[PDB]
């Protein structure tokens, strides 16, 4: 339960970034891979499509 | 088509939008009187302009000219009611002598503080908006209500308030259901 206590003691807050280093070393990956932009599309499950203006007519 | 209702601007922005002197003045007022935005400090300056404008055009004229007599008298009247000035002003120079504070200080949010019906300034804005004030027997929820000289003594608190009589609270009333 030192998840919680270590959480406590570290929120007094020194110094200052270890958040960087994890992504910083995930970009240490080499000269390779592609970086598609998968970047926000997010929505609730529900969707619709229609023609609507609508018609042609005849 | 065929609506004849009219609408017009009140406030207009100042030219030259970054000036160190201007920004000082603005800010200083804006938390002293608890004003929401800069839009308000401009809104007052508007009235003040158009006021002194007419008064100046009148001051110009030869004495005993029709427009000067008529219009003059009425301008002066309503700068003694809304209490921007004393009743010992009449020369149409005192009009022009007005500045921004005189306007601001008659807005309801100010007046409340002075008659000791709220502890703080920000307190007093809240207190009016959430419906615990009157101005004769009429309940006002707008802090930008100018108060006339004659009105002032009547302000008190509303009696539909918890702070007056009737129908106590929201806090209390919810607890009293639970138990």
């Amino acid at each position: 339960s030192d998840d919680d206590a270590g959480g406590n003691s570290a929120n007094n807050k020194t110094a200052g970034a270890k958040k960087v280093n994890k992504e910083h070393a995930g970009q240490r990956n080499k000269k390779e891979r592609s970086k598609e932009d998968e970047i926000r599309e997010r929505s609730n499950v529900i969707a619709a499509t229609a023609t609507v203006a609508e018609w042609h007519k005849q | 088509m065929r609506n004849y209702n009219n609408f017009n601007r009140v406030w207009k922005a100042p030219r030259r939008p970054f000036e160190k002197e201007r920004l000082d003045r603005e800010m200083k007022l804006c938390g002293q009187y608890g004003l929401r935005c800069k839009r308000e400090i401009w809104r007052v300056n508007m009235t003040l302009s158009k006021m002194r404008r007419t008064a100046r055009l009148l001051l110009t004229l030869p004495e005993n000219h029709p427009r000067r007599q008529l219009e003059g008298s009425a301008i002066m009247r309503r700068c003694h009611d809304y209490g921007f000035l004393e009743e010992e002003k009449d020369k149409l120079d005192y009009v022009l002598s007005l500045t921004v504070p005189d306007i601001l200080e008659r807005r309801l949010q100010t007046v409340v503080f002075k008659h000791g019906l709220a502890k703080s300034v920000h307190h007093a804005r809240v207190l009016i908006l959430q419906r615990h004030i009157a101005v004769a027997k009429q309940i006002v929820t707008i802090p930008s209500f100018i108060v006339r000289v004659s009105s002032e003594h009547h302000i008190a608190f509303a009696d539909a308030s918890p702070f007056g009589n009737g129908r106590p609270g929201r806090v209390k009333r919810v607890k009293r259901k639970a138990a």
Binding site: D3, K22, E23, A25, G26, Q27, R28, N29, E32, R33, S34, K35, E36, D37, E38, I39, R40, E41, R42, S43, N44, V45 | -
Partner: protein, 145 residues
């Protein structure tokens, strides 16, 4: 194979395997390395991310350490993804890489067989479980025995 459509390589093995996971299900694939199974996870991640990123994909280590990090890296290059305030594309760990915690906020995870266990049975972590959709764990044959 003549077809190239909704997967690059493919060839034979994918045109079969894919149709199971497209319905969802279990299974396993007996297959020495050649295919490069990083396709499976790339397609899984395409589904839970493109559509309704609230559901957890999970990739579980054969045992801790070095592969944890190499996988983390490789994943993160298939494109970090914008969200509101926490949110977070990938959290790892344990260890021996990355190390203990960041536990919580995410979409897709990467830990080990002890970490995942505690996170599963425990009564307060139940919230996560029903949103995990969908868990793959890799090299069981010479690691489990």
């Amino acid at each position: 194979e003549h077809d190239y459509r909704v997967a690059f390589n493919p060839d034979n093995w994918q045109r079969e395997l894919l149709d199971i996971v497209d319905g969802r299900g279990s299974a396993v694939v007996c297959a020495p390395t050649s295919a490069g199974k990083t396709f499976i996870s790339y397609y899984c991640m395409y589904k839970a991310l493109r559509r309704t990123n609230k559901k957890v994909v999970v990739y579980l280590a054969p045992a801790r350490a070095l592969i944890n990090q190499a996988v983390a890296d490789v994943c993160a290059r298939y494109g970090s993804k914008k969200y509101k305030n926490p949110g977070r594309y990938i959290y790892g760990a344990l260890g021996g890489a990355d190390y203990h915690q960041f536990h919580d906020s995410c979409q897709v995870l990467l830990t080990v067989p002890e970490t995942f266990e505690t996170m599963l049975l425990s009564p307060k972590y139940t919230d996560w479980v029903e949103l995990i959709d969908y868990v793959i764990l890799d090299e069981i044959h010479s690691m489990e025995s």
